[PDB]
């Protein structure tokens, strides 16, 4: 009856079937990714609609009396993830139409069919087809087809389909006491209730701008190095003063720069570090590649795994009769369990993702006894930022010697680590301004300050001053260049990849200051140190019971988002790109266009 | 080793009284998943025994076995059950992936995570009370800052180490001022005859020579005495022989 005694009793009949109605869509989506039959897709639908109605049945009966009577800090930090009503504040003709437009947006992205209009008699499949023809085709007219036509037959009707989708998306968040849908992705970043550590949603707009100013000397030297090495490849297509064309970045849009590594090799006389030729001699199988990778988890100070991980999850593809989709996703299925489905091969990129997908297991292992609202990341990008600390530490040549992998007498000079660090520069730094200009494009079209004719004209004007690319053909107001990706078509957050590269670097810069490593941070390995886990164990168990401002105090000690771990990780990369750029053009300019002939 | 069990708020009281405990097939064989407890070691339970033993049957997650501790606070230890500071029992868990689970969700037994207040140790609360956290009443339904408690399980044997069905049987021991009734197994040795040896029987202790008796006896007796009040007879605790 007293007002101060009543803290929190929501987690009885909410937090026990928040997992369980998702559980019946968990394995039904997992059997959809292993056993694609005619009846293993129907159990995803009727059980996933029960969990989709569970978040709206309790939201209609939670509309009585307001929030301001609470005193405890543990009550408020879980309350923000349940009081979002979602789509249930609109009418009957407006709310259910959002469910139908999201099912027709993911179908044409996966089952698209676009090919050559000159000779359309042989027309190929998109997703295994066009992903691997970008790397080997050294022709200007061949790479022009795979970028232009894909947004010309798939993205031609999304432009009259995305304009009324943004308009209905403003109504579901303006009724949820927010200013827009633009801070709905920043709603997880909202910190309230602690004095001195208040992080509002309006503070995040200047914070991404503050960390982008010091990356402009680092990115424009990588912008001038790929361009200077494409003179012998493309002599009369790319200008040395202007920007690079966007249809030759190696992928479908230019988020990852991974296929431009073999053409921009600095020194071709020395071999790259390679595990693929030394794997087939010792005859490894699927049981070895997770057991010695779990030896990396014991040696820091995290406890062992029991028999439930080895007999439930399989690593081999179950025959050639049944199709199994094997995208690398660590399955966070509810209150702390992980079944791993990965089509493993003898591949270095498969070996680093074995430490990546198991790095999302070790974050959710420590708060497995915590509630499900606290069983999440500190933000959306906090889950994958603490997962790739095991992959950058396993690509270290000092770790490969202790196990028995590579040759025991391998030469390590100053010209060895530079080809490894420019491989990491097109994986970490190469996606960093590409994450910026799409999230700023999302924050400029949701508020509605711009007209309909400047919807796509603002997209190609940002890419010639942020990332330094220019389109070879111009687009009218009927096409869409950013809306043909995986995260935007299936309505996923794109802010989670900008904080993936920032929170990962803050943890690894201080992890071997506890383990007492002398040298650069790309030779830092966190193995054979039992005191290196104790700095992480108070951070791996804080989840959302403590916010992300107090989560960074025990490792790095910075309450704000800083750029200083990103600078001294690449300290040979800042010095050795300077002497080779004495005569080229630093940066980019807004005058060169390929269609301005 | 039952085929059914109960809820963690609907704990049955398996009253183990006037029994003989056999731990040579349960503790020494150990077919359970983990065998770890505090307070009293399980090797001291064969040589020490108590007045009244109480047991239960409940299946929980593998994450809630850290909550079952004397003096524990947290998620389960103050709102579903509470172990007291004088807890002299032991907590044994076993994975029950093939028996206690159910396909298409386990929707039969329920459990809680929070409560109105801190419960007493060994409290059987089966209430379906209405909660009110703020200043306006709820009239039986949930609300903004008004919640309700009572939801069931999520068990399935295809996943990892977090929330598999772990059958936890807490064998609570209690020593009272009453004498003991339930005690554990104690090993036996062979019997030698016609030699001056020592005696360590069930109710006898001495030193003498065992010969064949030619007298009559009562089977509810422990020993016998001669005309000079000395112990000259012993009954075997296993066989009906003097």
PDB file of N, CA and C in Angstrom, chain A residues 3 5-13 15-17 20-21 23-24 26-27 61-62 64-67 69-70 79 83 305-306 308 312 333-337 339 365 368-371, chain B residues 33 61 63 75 104-105 107 111-117 131-136 138 141-154 156-164:
ATOM      1  N   UNK A   3       3.936   3.734  -1.151  1.00  0.00           N
ATOM      2  CA  UNK A   3       4.348   4.112  -2.501  1.00  0.00           C
ATOM      3  C   UNK A   3       5.831   3.798  -2.725  1.00  0.00           C
ATOM      4  N   UNK A   5       7.640   1.282  -1.330  1.00  0.00           N
ATOM      5  CA  UNK A   5       7.986  -0.132  -1.248  1.00  0.00           C
ATOM      6  C   UNK A   5       7.804  -0.862  -2.575  1.00  0.00           C
ATOM      7  N   UNK A   6       6.931  -0.368  -3.450  1.00  0.00           N
ATOM      8  CA  UNK A   6       6.562  -1.074  -4.677  1.00  0.00           C
ATOM      9  C   UNK A   6       7.552  -0.715  -5.782  1.00  0.00           C
ATOM     10  N   UNK A   7       8.473  -1.640  -6.059  1.00  0.00           N
ATOM     11  CA  UNK A   7       9.501  -1.375  -7.062  1.00  0.00           C
ATOM     12  C   UNK A   7       9.157  -1.938  -8.443  1.00  0.00           C
ATOM     13  N   UNK A   8       9.092  -3.266  -8.571  1.00  0.00           N
ATOM     14  CA  UNK A   8       9.028  -3.900  -9.889  1.00  0.00           C
ATOM     15  C   UNK A   8       8.541  -5.335  -9.758  1.00  0.00           C
ATOM     16  N   UNK A   9       7.403  -5.647 -10.402  1.00  0.00           N
ATOM     17  CA  UNK A   9       6.901  -7.016 -10.495  1.00  0.00           C
ATOM     18  C   UNK A   9       6.388  -7.284 -11.922  1.00  0.00           C
ATOM     19  N   UNK A  10       6.986  -6.660 -12.943  1.00  0.00           N
ATOM     20  CA  UNK A  10       6.488  -6.863 -14.304  1.00  0.00           C
ATOM     21  C   UNK A  10       6.989  -8.173 -14.894  1.00  0.00           C
ATOM     22  N   UNK A  11       8.103  -8.687 -14.381  1.00  0.00           N
ATOM     23  CA  UNK A  11       8.830  -9.761 -15.049  1.00  0.00           C
ATOM     24  C   UNK A  11       8.310 -11.160 -14.721  1.00  0.00           C
ATOM     25  N   UNK A  12       7.094 -11.283 -14.188  1.00  0.00           N
ATOM     26  CA  UNK A  12       6.511 -12.590 -13.923  1.00  0.00           C
ATOM     27  C   UNK A  12       5.782 -13.127 -15.151  1.00  0.00           C
ATOM     28  N   UNK A  13       4.786 -12.385 -15.635  1.00  0.00           N
ATOM     29  CA  UNK A  13       3.926 -12.807 -16.736  1.00  0.00           C
ATOM     30  C   UNK A  13       4.214 -11.983 -17.983  1.00  0.00           C
ATOM     31  N   UNK A  15       8.062 -11.588 -18.749  1.00  0.00           N
ATOM     32  CA  UNK A  15       9.420 -12.008 -19.056  1.00  0.00           C
ATOM     33  C   UNK A  15       9.596 -13.520 -19.067  1.00  0.00           C
ATOM     34  N   UNK A  16       8.508 -14.288 -19.119  1.00  0.00           N
ATOM     35  CA  UNK A  16       8.597 -15.739 -19.214  1.00  0.00           C
ATOM     36  C   UNK A  16       8.005 -16.270 -20.509  1.00  0.00           C
ATOM     37  N   UNK A  17       7.128 -15.507 -21.158  1.00  0.00           N
ATOM     38  CA  UNK A  17       6.696 -15.822 -22.511  1.00  0.00           C
ATOM     39  C   UNK A  17       7.104 -14.757 -23.520  1.00  0.00           C
ATOM     40  N   UNK A  20       9.202 -17.349 -24.733  1.00  0.00           N
ATOM     41  CA  UNK A  20       8.587 -18.635 -25.066  1.00  0.00           C
ATOM     42  C   UNK A  20       7.723 -18.562 -26.323  1.00  0.00           C
ATOM     43  N   UNK A  21       7.097 -17.415 -26.587  1.00  0.00           N
ATOM     44  CA  UNK A  21       6.412 -17.263 -27.867  1.00  0.00           C
ATOM     45  C   UNK A  21       7.396 -16.882 -28.968  1.00  0.00           C
ATOM     46  N   UNK A  23      10.335 -18.439 -28.748  1.00  0.00           N
ATOM     47  CA  UNK A  23      10.955 -19.769 -28.806  1.00  0.00           C
ATOM     48  C   UNK A  23      10.306 -20.641 -29.868  1.00  0.00           C
ATOM     49  N   UNK A  24       8.988 -20.508 -30.021  1.00  0.00           N
ATOM     50  CA  UNK A  24       8.259 -21.294 -31.005  1.00  0.00           C
ATOM     51  C   UNK A  24       8.459 -20.758 -32.415  1.00  0.00           C
ATOM     52  N   UNK A  26      11.629 -19.476 -32.836  1.00  0.00           N
ATOM     53  CA  UNK A  26      13.088 -19.550 -32.868  1.00  0.00           C
ATOM     54  C   UNK A  26      13.566 -20.758 -33.657  1.00  0.00           C
ATOM     55  N   UNK A  27      13.180 -21.960 -33.219  1.00  0.00           N
ATOM     56  CA  UNK A  27      13.572 -23.173 -33.921  1.00  0.00           C
ATOM     57  C   UNK A  27      12.828 -23.332 -35.241  1.00  0.00           C
ATOM     58  N   UNK A  61      -3.447  -2.937 -23.084  1.00  0.00           N
ATOM     59  CA  UNK A  61      -3.809  -2.946 -21.673  1.00  0.00           C
ATOM     60  C   UNK A  61      -2.727  -2.342 -20.783  1.00  0.00           C
ATOM     61  N   UNK A  62      -1.965  -1.374 -21.294  1.00  0.00           N
ATOM     62  CA  UNK A  62      -0.970  -0.653 -20.504  1.00  0.00           C
ATOM     63  C   UNK A  62      -1.113   0.848 -20.707  1.00  0.00           C
ATOM     64  N   UNK A  64      -3.016   3.326 -18.694  1.00  0.00           N
ATOM     65  CA  UNK A  64      -3.815   3.817 -17.573  1.00  0.00           C
ATOM     66  C   UNK A  64      -3.220   5.037 -16.877  1.00  0.00           C
ATOM     67  N   UNK A  65      -2.019   4.956 -16.316  1.00  0.00           N
ATOM     68  CA  UNK A  65      -1.528   6.019 -15.450  1.00  0.00           C
ATOM     69  C   UNK A  65      -0.020   6.171 -15.599  1.00  0.00           C
ATOM     70  N   UNK A  66       0.502   7.441 -15.591  1.00  0.00           N
ATOM     71  CA  UNK A  66       1.876   7.688 -16.074  1.00  0.00           C
ATOM     72  C   UNK A  66       3.034   7.228 -15.192  1.00  0.00           C
ATOM     73  N   UNK A  67       4.239   7.644 -15.597  1.00  0.00           N
ATOM     74  CA  UNK A  67       5.502   6.996 -15.265  1.00  0.00           C
ATOM     75  C   UNK A  67       6.198   7.538 -14.019  1.00  0.00           C
ATOM     76  N   UNK A  69       6.297   8.050 -10.872  1.00  0.00           N
ATOM     77  CA  UNK A  69       6.261   7.651  -9.471  1.00  0.00           C
ATOM     78  C   UNK A  69       7.360   6.660  -9.098  1.00  0.00           C
ATOM     79  N   UNK A  70       8.340   6.438  -9.968  1.00  0.00           N
ATOM     80  CA  UNK A  70       9.352   5.409  -9.750  1.00  0.00           C
ATOM     81  C   UNK A  70      10.584   6.038  -9.117  1.00  0.00           C
ATOM     82  N   UNK A  79      12.227  -0.420 -18.493  1.00  0.00           N
ATOM     83  CA  UNK A  79      10.895   0.046 -18.865  1.00  0.00           C
ATOM     84  C   UNK A  79      10.847   0.658 -20.260  1.00  0.00           C
ATOM     85  N   UNK A  83       7.510  -0.148 -23.246  1.00  0.00           N
ATOM     86  CA  UNK A  83       6.468   0.857 -23.390  1.00  0.00           C
ATOM     87  C   UNK A  83       6.381   1.435 -24.795  1.00  0.00           C
ATOM     88  N   UNK A 305      32.494 -24.763 -21.465  1.00  0.00           N
ATOM     89  CA  UNK A 305      31.187 -25.094 -22.013  1.00  0.00           C
ATOM     90  C   UNK A 305      30.926 -26.587 -21.842  1.00  0.00           C
ATOM     91  N   UNK A 306      29.668 -26.938 -21.588  1.00  0.00           N
ATOM     92  CA  UNK A 306      29.286 -28.319 -21.327  1.00  0.00           C
ATOM     93  C   UNK A 306      28.913 -29.017 -22.638  1.00  0.00           C
ATOM     94  N   UNK A 308      26.113 -29.528 -24.150  1.00  0.00           N
ATOM     95  CA  UNK A 308      24.980 -29.057 -24.931  1.00  0.00           C
ATOM     96  C   UNK A 308      25.353 -28.301 -26.193  1.00  0.00           C
ATOM     97  N   UNK A 312      24.087 -30.633 -30.124  1.00  0.00           N
ATOM     98  CA  UNK A 312      22.953 -29.946 -30.731  1.00  0.00           C
ATOM     99  C   UNK A 312      23.334 -29.230 -32.021  1.00  0.00           C
ATOM    100  N   UNK A 333      18.670 -16.322 -29.204  1.00  0.00           N
ATOM    101  CA  UNK A 333      17.298 -16.808 -29.251  1.00  0.00           C
ATOM    102  C   UNK A 333      16.534 -16.629 -27.944  1.00  0.00           C
ATOM    103  N   UNK A 334      17.156 -16.077 -26.907  1.00  0.00           N
ATOM    104  CA  UNK A 334      16.419 -15.775 -25.696  1.00  0.00           C
ATOM    105  C   UNK A 334      16.975 -16.381 -24.426  1.00  0.00           C
ATOM    106  N   UNK A 335      17.179 -15.503 -23.422  1.00  0.00           N
ATOM    107  CA  UNK A 335      17.725 -15.746 -22.060  1.00  0.00           C
ATOM    108  C   UNK A 335      18.956 -16.663 -22.026  1.00  0.00           C
ATOM    109  N   UNK A 336      19.869 -16.452 -22.974  1.00  0.00           N
ATOM    110  CA  UNK A 336      21.216 -16.986 -22.880  1.00  0.00           C
ATOM    111  C   UNK A 336      21.490 -18.368 -23.441  1.00  0.00           C
ATOM    112  N   UNK A 337      21.164 -18.604 -24.710  1.00  0.00           N
ATOM    113  CA  UNK A 337      21.573 -19.830 -25.383  1.00  0.00           C
ATOM    114  C   UNK A 337      21.965 -19.519 -26.818  1.00  0.00           C
ATOM    115  N   UNK A 339      22.838 -21.700 -30.492  1.00  0.00           N
ATOM    116  CA  UNK A 339      23.074 -22.788 -31.426  1.00  0.00           C
ATOM    117  C   UNK A 339      23.694 -22.221 -32.696  1.00  0.00           C
ATOM    118  N   UNK A 365      26.548 -14.856 -22.337  1.00  0.00           N
ATOM    119  CA  UNK A 365      26.730 -15.924 -21.358  1.00  0.00           C
ATOM    120  C   UNK A 365      26.729 -15.376 -19.933  1.00  0.00           C
ATOM    121  N   UNK A 368      23.224 -14.381 -18.386  1.00  0.00           N
ATOM    122  CA  UNK A 368      22.226 -15.405 -18.665  1.00  0.00           C
ATOM    123  C   UNK A 368      21.207 -15.559 -17.543  1.00  0.00           C
ATOM    124  N   UNK A 369      21.569 -15.190 -16.314  1.00  0.00           N
ATOM    125  CA  UNK A 369      20.629 -15.171 -15.201  1.00  0.00           C
ATOM    126  C   UNK A 369      19.920 -13.830 -15.048  1.00  0.00           C
ATOM    127  N   UNK A 370      20.165 -12.883 -15.944  1.00  0.00           N
ATOM    128  CA  UNK A 370      19.534 -11.571 -15.914  1.00  0.00           C
ATOM    129  C   UNK A 370      18.221 -11.607 -16.687  1.00  0.00           C
ATOM    130  N   UNK A 371      17.335 -10.616 -16.477  1.00  0.00           N
ATOM    131  CA  UNK A 371      16.123 -10.513 -17.309  1.00  0.00           C
ATOM    132  C   UNK A 371      16.383 -10.244 -18.790  1.00  0.00           C
TER     133      UNK A 371
ATOM    134  N   UNK B  33      23.969 -34.471 -13.482  1.00  0.00           N
ATOM    135  CA  UNK B  33      24.839 -33.606 -14.275  1.00  0.00           C
ATOM    136  C   UNK B  33      25.948 -33.010 -13.417  1.00  0.00           C
ATOM    137  N   UNK B  61      15.953 -23.590 -14.991  1.00  0.00           N
ATOM    138  CA  UNK B  61      17.014 -23.335 -15.950  1.00  0.00           C
ATOM    139  C   UNK B  61      18.377 -23.693 -15.361  1.00  0.00           C
ATOM    140  N   UNK B  63      20.670 -21.406 -15.456  1.00  0.00           N
ATOM    141  CA  UNK B  63      21.141 -20.117 -14.973  1.00  0.00           C
ATOM    142  C   UNK B  63      20.680 -19.830 -13.551  1.00  0.00           C
ATOM    143  N   UNK B  75      17.463 -12.949  -8.350  1.00  0.00           N
ATOM    144  CA  UNK B  75      16.281 -13.097  -9.193  1.00  0.00           C
ATOM    145  C   UNK B  75      15.309 -14.127  -8.627  1.00  0.00           C
ATOM    146  N   UNK B 104       7.031 -28.560 -28.984  1.00  0.00           N
ATOM    147  CA  UNK B 104       6.127 -27.418 -29.230  1.00  0.00           C
ATOM    148  C   UNK B 104       5.850 -26.607 -27.961  1.00  0.00           C
ATOM    149  N   UNK B 105       6.870 -26.442 -27.123  1.00  0.00           N
ATOM    150  CA  UNK B 105       6.745 -25.654 -25.912  1.00  0.00           C
ATOM    151  C   UNK B 105       6.163 -26.411 -24.735  1.00  0.00           C
ATOM    152  N   UNK B 107       4.022 -25.954 -21.725  1.00  0.00           N
ATOM    153  CA  UNK B 107       3.046 -24.985 -21.242  1.00  0.00           C
ATOM    154  C   UNK B 107       2.242 -25.485 -20.041  1.00  0.00           C
ATOM    155  N   UNK B 111       6.236 -20.507 -13.080  1.00  0.00           N
ATOM    156  CA  UNK B 111       7.254 -19.999 -12.164  1.00  0.00           C
ATOM    157  C   UNK B 111       7.221 -18.475 -12.201  1.00  0.00           C
ATOM    158  N   UNK B 112       7.831 -17.857 -11.189  1.00  0.00           N
ATOM    159  CA  UNK B 112       7.827 -16.409 -11.034  1.00  0.00           C
ATOM    160  C   UNK B 112       9.249 -15.868 -11.087  1.00  0.00           C
ATOM    161  N   UNK B 113       9.348 -14.537 -11.103  1.00  0.00           N
ATOM    162  CA  UNK B 113      10.628 -13.843 -11.078  1.00  0.00           C
ATOM    163  C   UNK B 113      10.654 -12.699 -10.069  1.00  0.00           C
ATOM    164  N   UNK B 114       9.498 -12.137  -9.714  1.00  0.00           N
ATOM    165  CA  UNK B 114       9.420 -11.068  -8.727  1.00  0.00           C
ATOM    166  C   UNK B 114       8.198 -11.306  -7.848  1.00  0.00           C
ATOM    167  N   UNK B 115       8.035 -10.456  -6.835  1.00  0.00           N
ATOM    168  CA  UNK B 115       6.992 -10.646  -5.833  1.00  0.00           C
ATOM    169  C   UNK B 115       6.660  -9.298  -5.203  1.00  0.00           C
ATOM    170  N   UNK B 116       5.604  -9.292  -4.378  1.00  0.00           N
ATOM    171  CA  UNK B 116       5.242  -8.108  -3.605  1.00  0.00           C
ATOM    172  C   UNK B 116       6.275  -7.799  -2.529  1.00  0.00           C
ATOM    173  N   UNK B 117       6.794  -8.827  -1.861  1.00  0.00           N
ATOM    174  CA  UNK B 117       7.762  -8.640  -0.791  1.00  0.00           C
ATOM    175  C   UNK B 117       8.659  -9.867  -0.724  1.00  0.00           C
ATOM    176  N   UNK B 131      -1.505  -6.500  -8.523  1.00  0.00           N
ATOM    177  CA  UNK B 131      -0.480  -5.556  -8.108  1.00  0.00           C
ATOM    178  C   UNK B 131      -0.902  -4.123  -8.410  1.00  0.00           C
ATOM    179  N   UNK B 132      -0.364  -3.193  -7.622  1.00  0.00           N
ATOM    180  CA  UNK B 132      -0.564  -1.758  -7.823  1.00  0.00           C
ATOM    181  C   UNK B 132       0.696  -1.039  -7.351  1.00  0.00           C
ATOM    182  N   UNK B 133       1.482  -0.532  -8.299  1.00  0.00           N
ATOM    183  CA  UNK B 133       2.728   0.151  -7.976  1.00  0.00           C
ATOM    184  C   UNK B 133       2.566   1.649  -7.777  1.00  0.00           C
ATOM    185  N   UNK B 134       1.609   2.278  -8.455  1.00  0.00           N
ATOM    186  CA  UNK B 134       1.476   3.722  -8.406  1.00  0.00           C
ATOM    187  C   UNK B 134       0.412   4.260  -7.473  1.00  0.00           C
ATOM    188  N   UNK B 135      -0.331   5.269  -7.940  1.00  0.00           N
ATOM    189  CA  UNK B 135      -1.308   5.962  -7.113  1.00  0.00           C
ATOM    190  C   UNK B 135      -2.758   5.770  -7.546  1.00  0.00           C
ATOM    191  N   UNK B 136      -3.009   5.177  -8.711  1.00  0.00           N
ATOM    192  CA  UNK B 136      -4.359   4.881  -9.159  1.00  0.00           C
ATOM    193  C   UNK B 136      -4.544   3.366  -9.199  1.00  0.00           C
ATOM    194  N   UNK B 138      -6.040  -0.556 -10.062  1.00  0.00           N
ATOM    195  CA  UNK B 138      -5.933  -1.292 -11.313  1.00  0.00           C
ATOM    196  C   UNK B 138      -7.179  -2.079 -11.688  1.00  0.00           C
ATOM    197  N   UNK B 141      -6.806  -5.680 -13.704  1.00  0.00           N
ATOM    198  CA  UNK B 141      -6.092  -5.770 -14.972  1.00  0.00           C
ATOM    199  C   UNK B 141      -4.743  -5.077 -14.831  1.00  0.00           C
ATOM    200  N   UNK B 142      -3.851  -5.371 -15.776  1.00  0.00           N
ATOM    201  CA  UNK B 142      -2.533  -4.754 -15.795  1.00  0.00           C
ATOM    202  C   UNK B 142      -2.618  -3.346 -16.387  1.00  0.00           C
ATOM    203  N   UNK B 143      -1.493  -2.642 -16.377  1.00  0.00           N
ATOM    204  CA  UNK B 143      -1.495  -1.270 -16.841  1.00  0.00           C
ATOM    205  C   UNK B 143      -0.093  -0.726 -16.996  1.00  0.00           C
ATOM    206  N   UNK B 144      -0.049   0.571 -17.296  1.00  0.00           N
ATOM    207  CA  UNK B 144       1.182   1.348 -17.273  1.00  0.00           C
ATOM    208  C   UNK B 144       1.641   1.451 -15.822  1.00  0.00           C
ATOM    209  N   UNK B 145       2.735   0.761 -15.504  1.00  0.00           N
ATOM    210  CA  UNK B 145       3.190   0.667 -14.116  1.00  0.00           C
ATOM    211  C   UNK B 145       2.265  -0.222 -13.249  1.00  0.00           C
ATOM    212  N   UNK B 146       1.372  -1.005 -13.872  1.00  0.00           N
ATOM    213  CA  UNK B 146       0.530  -1.978 -13.146  1.00  0.00           C
ATOM    214  C   UNK B 146       0.884  -3.271 -13.850  1.00  0.00           C
ATOM    215  N   UNK B 147       1.246  -4.299 -13.072  1.00  0.00           N
ATOM    216  CA  UNK B 147       1.675  -5.592 -13.673  1.00  0.00           C
ATOM    217  C   UNK B 147       0.946  -6.765 -13.004  1.00  0.00           C
ATOM    218  N   UNK B 148       1.113  -7.955 -13.585  1.00  0.00           N
ATOM    219  CA  UNK B 148       0.487  -9.161 -13.060  1.00  0.00           C
ATOM    220  C   UNK B 148       1.509 -10.344 -13.097  1.00  0.00           C
ATOM    221  N   UNK B 149       1.431 -11.328 -12.151  1.00  0.00           N
ATOM    222  CA  UNK B 149       2.368 -12.457 -12.185  1.00  0.00           C
ATOM    223  C   UNK B 149       1.810 -13.880 -12.354  1.00  0.00           C
ATOM    224  N   UNK B 150       2.319 -14.654 -13.327  1.00  0.00           N
ATOM    225  CA  UNK B 150       1.918 -16.083 -13.509  1.00  0.00           C
ATOM    226  C   UNK B 150       2.163 -16.534 -14.955  1.00  0.00           C
ATOM    227  N   UNK B 151       3.355 -17.056 -15.269  1.00  0.00           N
ATOM    228  CA  UNK B 151       3.571 -17.576 -16.617  1.00  0.00           C
ATOM    229  C   UNK B 151       4.442 -18.842 -16.574  1.00  0.00           C
ATOM    230  N   UNK B 152       4.267 -19.720 -17.579  1.00  0.00           N
ATOM    231  CA  UNK B 152       4.794 -21.080 -17.625  1.00  0.00           C
ATOM    232  C   UNK B 152       6.183 -21.180 -18.272  1.00  0.00           C
ATOM    233  N   UNK B 153       6.584 -22.420 -18.580  1.00  0.00           N
ATOM    234  CA  UNK B 153       7.941 -22.809 -18.957  1.00  0.00           C
ATOM    235  C   UNK B 153       8.195 -22.643 -20.455  1.00  0.00           C
ATOM    236  N   UNK B 154       9.457 -22.850 -20.838  1.00  0.00           N
ATOM    237  CA  UNK B 154       9.912 -22.746 -22.227  1.00  0.00           C
ATOM    238  C   UNK B 154      10.922 -23.845 -22.565  1.00  0.00           C
ATOM    239  N   UNK B 156      12.805 -27.207 -24.123  1.00  0.00           N
ATOM    240  CA  UNK B 156      13.082 -27.897 -25.384  1.00  0.00           C
ATOM    241  C   UNK B 156      14.544 -28.346 -25.392  1.00  0.00           C
ATOM    242  N   UNK B 157      14.851 -29.592 -25.767  1.00  0.00           N
ATOM    243  CA  UNK B 157      16.216 -30.111 -25.599  1.00  0.00           C
ATOM    244  C   UNK B 157      17.189 -29.853 -26.741  1.00  0.00           C
ATOM    245  N   UNK B 158      16.917 -28.908 -27.635  1.00  0.00           N
ATOM    246  CA  UNK B 158      17.739 -28.719 -28.822  1.00  0.00           C
ATOM    247  C   UNK B 158      18.747 -27.579 -28.693  1.00  0.00           C
ATOM    248  N   UNK B 159      18.860 -26.949 -27.528  1.00  0.00           N
ATOM    249  CA  UNK B 159      19.676 -25.746 -27.368  1.00  0.00           C
ATOM    250  C   UNK B 159      20.817 -26.005 -26.387  1.00  0.00           C
ATOM    251  N   UNK B 160      21.498 -24.926 -26.003  1.00  0.00           N
ATOM    252  CA  UNK B 160      22.771 -25.026 -25.316  1.00  0.00           C
ATOM    253  C   UNK B 160      22.717 -25.207 -23.811  1.00  0.00           C
ATOM    254  N   UNK B 161      23.404 -24.333 -23.075  1.00  0.00           N
ATOM    255  CA  UNK B 161      23.707 -24.577 -21.669  1.00  0.00           C
ATOM    256  C   UNK B 161      22.905 -23.661 -20.752  1.00  0.00           C
ATOM    257  N   UNK B 162      22.158 -22.721 -21.331  1.00  0.00           N
ATOM    258  CA  UNK B 162      21.543 -21.684 -20.516  1.00  0.00           C
ATOM    259  C   UNK B 162      20.248 -22.126 -19.864  1.00  0.00           C
ATOM    260  N   UNK B 163      19.262 -22.505 -20.673  1.00  0.00           N
ATOM    261  CA  UNK B 163      17.931 -22.812 -20.158  1.00  0.00           C
ATOM    262  C   UNK B 163      17.464 -24.176 -20.642  1.00  0.00           C
ATOM    263  N   UNK B 164      18.333 -25.177 -20.524  1.00  0.00           N
ATOM    264  CA  UNK B 164      17.922 -26.558 -20.685  1.00  0.00           C
ATOM    265  C   UNK B 164      17.125 -26.997 -19.454  1.00  0.00           C
TER     266      UNK B 164
END
